[PDB]
A = this chain, B = another copy of it.
Amino acid sequence: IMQKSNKINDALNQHYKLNVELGLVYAHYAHVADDEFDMPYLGKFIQHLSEDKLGVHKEYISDYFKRNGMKLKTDVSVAVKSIPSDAKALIQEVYARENEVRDHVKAIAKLALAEDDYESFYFIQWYVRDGLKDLTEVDDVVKLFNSSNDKLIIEETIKEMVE
């Protein structure tokens, strides 16, 4: 009784992998935003997202598995082989990835209900809302680039968001 769902186990290991590799790409993007595009505050915004993906986003799954018998799998593979050409494109790529995270999370909630796994429906509840919150935070930045053509104006505006 209460035997863990292998489908849910797989999908949460997949999501664990996604957050690790995303966090590694964002750590690189954070470096580029500062060093190449001369936007250190944009860099700290993306670093904070990097530490988020590699922090609680992965630890919550780790900690959930210890409580329910699911097995953790560490299989990580990510290479940053090209970088967007400028800062706007850099944040827009981050947006496109965060929008995909929402879709992965939605598949997990759907599957949890399909598996009658209400503990896992509950756990994913945090990820459902962080999907929209993280995406909204990124969107608030993508936008600055369509409201000003001045890197330093945009930077001053980001400073009050990464406070």
Contacts and interface: CB of A to CB of B under 8 A. Distances in A.
A136 B67 contact: yes
A149 to B, nearest CB: 8
B66 A34 contact: yes
A35 B136 contact: no
Nearest to A135: B67
A1 B62 contact: no
A128 B39 CA distance: 26
Interface residues of A, number: 66
A65 B77 CA distance: 23
Given A72-B31, A74-B79, A106-B118, A38 B132 contact: no
Chain A interface, DSSP helix/strand/loop, else mixed: helix
Interface of A: 1-2, 20-21, 24-25, 27-28, 31-32, 34-35, 38-40, 54, 58, 62, 65-68, 72-80, 99-100, 102-103, 105-106, 109-110, 113, 116, 118-119, 122, 125, 128-129, 131-132, 135-136, 140, 143-144, 146-157
A128 B122 contact: yes
B152 A74 contact: no
